[model samples]
Target: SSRRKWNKTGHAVRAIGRLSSLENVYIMADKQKNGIKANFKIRHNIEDGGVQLAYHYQQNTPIGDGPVLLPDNHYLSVQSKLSKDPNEKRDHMVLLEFVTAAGITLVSKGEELFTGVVPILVELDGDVNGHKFSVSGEGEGDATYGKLTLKFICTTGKLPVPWPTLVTTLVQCFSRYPDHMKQHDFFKSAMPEGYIQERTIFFKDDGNYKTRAEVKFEGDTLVNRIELKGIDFKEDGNILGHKLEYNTRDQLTEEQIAEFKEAFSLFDKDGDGTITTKELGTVMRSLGQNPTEAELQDMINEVDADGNGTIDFPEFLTMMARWMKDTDSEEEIREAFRVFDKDGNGYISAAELRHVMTNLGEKLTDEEVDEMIREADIDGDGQVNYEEFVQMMT
Candidate 1:
C-alpha cells in the first residue's frame, strides 16, 4: 500500500522539483550561428517554486580584433509544471519570464517541453522582449548516458537577455527533477567513476604565504592538475620600477615560476600568449597605474626581447625573475623603511602606508593597509616600527 502511494505521489512531485545550484557554467552558441560564449549561473529558489538564471554577457570572449564588451546584468525567472498531454514522452514543460528593474513583466510566447532520458534535453523557441530566439541543450549529468551541449540562435531583433541564458535555464529543467530520473533503470546504470583531490599549503600564520593545487583522475590515468602560488608585494614592488636587478631566468624556483605564470596570465588578456601594448595599458590602468603613452611604450621596450614591441611569456618571466632575485642589504632595507616613515615618526602608521602606496601608483584600500600593518606589527602597537618593517621586508 505504501509503495503504491509513493508511486502515485512521487511521480508527480518529481516532475516539478527544484534544480541544483549551478555556478560558473560556460555556455556557447552553435558554430553555424554567431558562436558567442559566456558565463552563467542557475540558482534555485527554495522559498518558492521557481528558479533564477543570471547572464554575464559583458564577460564574453573577444569575437575578433574588436574591443572588450561593456558589463551589464540580466536575469530570467523560470516556472514549470507537468505536461498535460497524455501521450507526451517528456515529464514537464516550462514558462520563462523576465521582470525588468522598473517592475515590468515580459513572458515567452509558448511553453517548451523537456525530453531525453539521461542527459535530458530541451528545445526552447519563443519571442520575448521583441526578440525571436531558439535554444537547445542538455542538462548536467554523466556523459556515459548521452551527449551534452548547449546551442542557441537569435533569429530576429536584439535580445534583452542573451540566448545562452535561455538555453541554460531550459537544460536545468530536467536537472531539477533528479528523483524522476533516478526512478529509471538507465540512470542507475550510468554513474561517474572518478574523484578529485585538492590540497593547500600555508607558510605563514597570517595565511599570506599560501599555495594550492588540485588534481583530477578518471579510472587511473591522470586527467588534469592545477597548481597555484602566492605572490609577495615586496618582490612585485621591485618589478614595478622601484629598483632594478639582474639574474638568469634558469635559476628561478618552482614557487617563483608559478607566481610569475599567474602574473603573466593577468597581463596577457584573451590568452594570446603575448602581452601587447594595449593589453599592458589596460591591465596597468585597472591596477590604478596612470602611465603616459611614452612611459607605457618604454615599459614594453625595456623588456621586449627580439624587438617585436610585445612581451612574450619568456620575456615576462625573465623580467620577474631578475627582480625576484634582488636581495636587499641592511642599509638598503632601512632606507626603504625610512621612505615610508614620513616626518621621521620612527614608525610607519596606517596613513603613512596608504600615502606611500598611493603615491607609488598602487591603489590599496584602507582595509588592505590595515591588514598589512597587522601582519607586520609584531608587538600589536597598531603601527609598524623599524624592526617590524625590516622583518616584513626580509
Candidate 2:
C-alpha cells in the first residue's frame, strides 16, 4: 500500500557510464559526472614506473566494489584522463568521484535477481541533517544502470522521521534515467537470470554521438578523459564503418610490447591498415607455419561475428586488445595499444601501414633482421634496444 504513495520530495542521481578509449564517453543529460577513477595506489618496492595499471570502477551511489556503488553525498560527480606510455598496464586510467558537504549522509543499494535483467533489489538512503544520500546498482549483461538526472526543488515542509514516502515518490519521479550503465567486463561479473525490463545504450560501434555530454566532479576537478572510446585515428576501414584507436599513457611495459607487435603483424592481412582472420593466419604461419583448418575455424568461432569467414579491423583490434593486454581493467584495455611493428623492427612500429606484401607472415632471416635493425634501430650501433622494439609495435 505504501509503495503506491502519490506525493514526495527527494534527491536524484544523474547517471554512471564507462567511456571507451576508441570513442567519446558521455551522458544523455548535463547533470551527471563524466568518468570514474580506476586503481591508483602507492607502494614502495620494485622500480620501473610503479607498475601503473589502468582500471575501471562501476557506477554506485557510495562508489564501492560493485559495478555501481552508492554515494554518501547529495551532489556527486565523475571524470577520466589518459596519457601515452609504451609499457603501462592501462593506457588510460579513469577517475570517478563525488562531492558533498562534510556532514552529509548518503545511501544507495542494488541487488541481483535469479533471472532478471536489472538487479531485483533496489534501495535508497539520504540524510538531510547529515547532508548525505546514496544509491547502488547490481546486475549483469542482465542489467545496465544510468543515473537519474531530474533536479528537484524542495516543494513541501521540513524533514520527517525515518524519512517519508514523499521523498521516495519525488526520487522515483525525477530520477528517471537510462536503465543501465555501459560496461566492458574485464573481470567475470554476476548477471540476473530473468528479463523483466529491457534497456540498452550505444557503444563504440553504435550509431549515436548525441548520447554525449560533460559533468563536474569533486572540487570541480577537470576530468579530461571523461569521453567514452575517446581516443581514435582516422582509418580507411574498420568493422563498424570505423572504430576508435586506443593509445594512451604508456600502458604496456616494454616486456609486453614484443608480444603485441607479433600479434599485430600476424593479424594485419590485406597489406592495408586493418586485420581479419585471413590476415591473422599470416601471423600463425609466420610463427611456424600455416594455421590448420581447425585453428582457423576456432578463430572464426571466437573472433568473427558474421559467418562470412572474415574478421574486420575493428573486430580484430577488439579481440587483440582483449588478448594482448596484460591487465584486467576495461578502461585500461579499451584504450590499450594497437599492435603494429609494420616495419619488422624489434619494437613498436608504425600504425595502419601497408606491409602485407613487402614484409608479412615470414620467418626473420639474418638479412631481414639486419635491415630491420637499420631502419628501426635509429642508432645503427648494434643490438636492438627495447625502445627500438617498442617503436615497431605501434
Candidate 3:
C-alpha cells in the first residue's frame, strides 16, 4: 500500500468502473517491435474501480534472483478497478487477459483473485495479431447486480470512436427528460448476456413493438428515429402518442431550445458570440477526440454562415437544435443538403443532385431530378445554395 516500503522499481497503472459484476478484460500491446523486455505487476481494485499495472526490470547480471530497477521506457497513463465478494458485495471484477508480441496470457479472474485467492488456469495458446490492440471479457451475475463487460478493439491506424459523441449519443433522448433509465432490482437471472459490445440501442415504454424507437446515427448526427412523430414539444419534448407526424421545422418546446442553447454556450467559452475552428478544435480534444486540422476545417465549412468562416452563436444553436428535431435552423437546411450533396461543397448542382437521386436504391428518372433542382434553385443558378434550400424546406 505504501510506495516507501517497496523498492522504487516500478510505475503504477489503472482502470475504473461503477458496476457490481465480474468483468472479463483484456489489454494488448500497441507496438510489437519496440525494444524492451517488459515486466510488471498488475492488479485491479473494486473500491475505486481501478485496474493498475506496475512495471519493473532486472537491474543486473543473470542470477536466480537479481536486483530490480525501473526501466527508462517506464511510461504511464496520465488518465486512468476491483473487488467483490461474489455473494455479498455483488461487485464487478476482471477476467483479465494480455496480448503481446510473444503471445497471449490469461491474467486472472475475479473469483480467483477475490474469493479463492488462488490462480485459475485458463487455456491460453496464441491469438495476438501484430497490429490490433483489443480487450474482451464479461461480468457474470443477475441483470441488475452485474455490470456490463469491458470490451475494446482498436486497429493499429484507426482512432477509437469519439468519446464525447459516444457517451452523449447513448442517452440523447432519455437525457432530455429529468428522469433516466434505472431499476430497483438488477438480478443475474434477468441480466443480458455479454458485457460490452457495439450494438443498436432500442427505446420503448413496454414490450409493445409498435411503440419501439431505435437510436441511430445519420452521419455524425444522432437521432432517436429517422422520422420521429407524435413528439410533444410541450411535454418536455416527449413523444406522447404512438405516432404523430408534421412537416417543416418540427416544433420543440422552449425548454428544449434552452437545452440546446446551453450546449452551444458550453463550447462558446469566450462568450464572443462565435465559435472559431480553433475553439471547436480545443473542445474536441477535451472531449477525447483527436480531430485533425482538416476535419476541424471541414466542420466549420459545413456550418459557417455569412461565408465568414466561423460558427456564430446563432449558427451553433441552430446546428445543435436541429438534431433534436426538424427546426428552422441552418443546421436542418444543411442536413437536407447532405442528402444530395455528397461532395461537401456549399452548393448542390443539378448534376450532383441527379446523380445522388438516381442511386437512391429506388432510382429517380432524369426528369424527376431536373424538376427537383428547378423547384429549389431560386437564384437562377444551376445549383441550389443554402439560402434557397432553407426556403424550400421551411
Candidate 4:
C-alpha cells in the first residue's frame, strides 16, 4: 500500500522506503536542521541537496540490544555532493563528523583530508563507558551510494549490575522513472531504482498538475516543500498527449485527443478542417515520389470516412491507426476480428460479416455478401480467418 501511495505521489518508484523507529526505541529530529538528522519523532526526513541522517535519544524510552549501552549525547551530520556532468570524471564528495558532549571527536572526515575518496561504509569501534561499542553507516545514492544502513552494537561488561545496551537499526534503504521502471514479468522488477528521488514521475489518473510536482527527500519521507515551478506539457495544450492509455479503455484521453489535433495540423496545410488529395500529392513530393492523381485518390479513399471529398483529423487517425504496426493496434485489430468471429472459431463466416452490415442498418444484397467473402477468403475457403480478415480490412 505504501508503494502504491508513493507511486501515486509522483515520486520516483524507489528501491527502499522511508526509515522508521526501532522496535522499542524512541526517535525524533530537529526542525531547523532539516539537513538529514534523525531523532525521536521524525520519519522520512529530507537531506537537503542530497540526504542527511541523525539518531536522537528521546527521554523516557527504554531502548537496548543484547547489552545495555549508554547514550553519549552525540549526533552526526554529513554532506555529500554528486555531479550530473557527463564529462566530469571526479563527481563524488563526502564529509562526515560526529562529536561527543565533551567536544571529543567521535569520528571526523574533511574534504581536504579525504579528497576524491567515496565513503561507501564508515565504521567506528572504541570504548563507551568501558563497554565494547561500535558504529557503522552507509550514505545515499550517486553522491554517496544511497542505500543507507546504520548499525550500532555494544557488548556488556562487568562494571555494574545494570549495564546499558545498544540497539542496531535497519533503514533498509534500498528511474527517468516511467522510462525507468517497467515490468519484466507479472510482478518482477525489470530495472528498479537504487533509491527513490523527488523527480519521480507517477502514473495515476488523478489529473492534477501537482501529480508531477518535484520535491526533496532525506531517506524515505518528503520535505513538504515545493522546490521549483512544475509544468504539465502533456495536458490539452501539448504534443505528446496525456499518460498513455491502454487498449482496455474505450475512449481517447482529452490529452491524447489534443495530441491528434496537433498532428492533424501538419497535414491540414492551409488551416482548413480538411486535407485535400492535392495536398497529399504535394506532401509526398518531399518523399521523392511523384504519386499519380489516381494513387492519391485511393489514399484519400482509404481514410475518407465521410466520403466528403477530403479527409479530417478523425479520419486521419483512423487511417494512421489502420496502418500502425505496434502491439496496441494489433490488439485492436484482433478485437475487431473477434467481433465478427461469433463462434470464436478464429474465423469469420459469411453469415457473421452479413451481421455487421445488418447491425449497421445496411440492407446488403446476397450477391454483395458473397462478394465480400470471396475477396477475404484468400485460401478459397468459404470463411475468412483472422489473418485473411485483417488483410482484407486493411
lDDT leader: 1
The 10-residue segment of model 2 with minimum total lDDT is 6-15
RMSD of 3: 26.2
Give the per-residue Cα lDDT of candidate 4 at 137. Answer: 31
Number of colliding residue pairs in each model: 0, 90, 26, 24
User: What's every prediction's RMSD, in angstroms?
Assistant: 26.5, 21.8, 26.2, 25.2
What's model 4's lDDT at 187? 8
Cα lDDT computed for each candidate against the true fold: 0.38, 0.27, 0.31, 0.33
lDDT of 2: 0.27
The superposed Cα distance between candidate 1 and the true structure at residue 55, in angstroms, equals 58
- Which residue segments of model 4 deviate by more than 4 Å? 1-330
Q: Over the stretch 1-394, how does candidate 1's per-residue lDDT look in tens digits?
A: 2222212222211211111112222233222322223344332221112222232331122223322212122122222211123453332222222111100111111001223333333344443322334443333322222223322223333333322223223322122212212221111111122112122222111111121212122332212222222233233222122222111113556755765676566567679888877877775454344667776665565555445677788866655543333333345456656666876878989898777556434555787778777777889999989887665643
Kindly list the per-residue Cα lDDT of model 2 for residues 1-394, writing each as its tens digit: 1111100000000000011121111112111532122211111111222122212222311112334332221211211112233453421212111111111211122232211222122222333223333332211122122222111222132222111111111211012112221121111111111111111222232221111212111231211111122122122212122222222233545434443344344455445644555655555453334666666644443444333455555444444443332222333322221222334453333221123212443433455444544565667665444555343322
Q: After superposition, how far is residue 132 of candidate 1 from its true place, in Å?
A: 90
Q: How do the predictions measure up, each by TM-score?
A: 0.28, 0.28, 0.22, 0.23
In model 1, the clashing pairs are: none
Candidate 1 deviates by what RMSD? 26.5
Give residue 278's error in model 2 in angstroms.
Answer: 5.2
Which portions of model 1 show Cα errors greater than 4 Å? 1-251, 265-271, 278-290, 328-371, 385-387
Q: Model 4: per-residue lDDT, tens digit, 329-393?
A: 34445665665676789987878867754543346687777777776677888988978855543
